[PDB]
């Protein structure tokens, strides 16, 4: 299994480009960090917009983890 607890690099998750750069250099280069970004974190990033929240969700749709819903 390659997703028992979700642990991949966001830069590869394929999320919106705005995410790759921001999330990555935002101390977040994986879906685990993307998971830590609670509602007052993902939308807090000054480099995260709707085009980013969408892809992120898609990721939580592939793994189904919480911490951001």
From Swiss-Prot:
This protein's domain notes: The N-terminal domain is essential for RNAP assembly and basal transcription, whereas the C-terminal domain is involved in interaction with transcriptional regulators and with upstream promoter elements.
Protein origin, superkingdom: Bacteria
Primary gene name: rpoA
Species in which this protein is naturally found: Thermus thermophilus
Assembly behavior: Homodimer. The RNAP catalytic core consists of 2 alpha, 1 beta, 1 beta' and 1 omega subunit. When a sigma factor is associated with the core the holoenzyme is formed, which can initiate transcription.
Sequence segments annotated as region (Alpha C-terminal domain (alpha-CTD)): 1-69
Family to which this protein belongs: Belongs to the RNA polymerase alpha chain family.
Part of the intact protein present: 247 to 315 of 315
General function of this protein: DNA-dependent RNA polymerase catalyzes the transcription of DNA into RNA using the four ribonucleoside triphosphates as substrates.
Protein name as it appears in the record: DNA-directed RNA polymerase subunit alpha
């Amino acid at each position: 299994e390659q997703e028992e607890e979700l642990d991949l690099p966001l830069e590869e998750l394929g999320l919106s480009t705005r995410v790759l750069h921001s999330l990555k250099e935002e101390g977040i280069e994986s879906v685990r960090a993307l998971l830590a970004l609670n509602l007052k974190d993902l939308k807090n990033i000054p480099g995260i917009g709707e085009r980013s929240l969408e892809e992120i969700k898609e990721a939580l749709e592939k793994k189904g983890f919480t911490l951001k819903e």
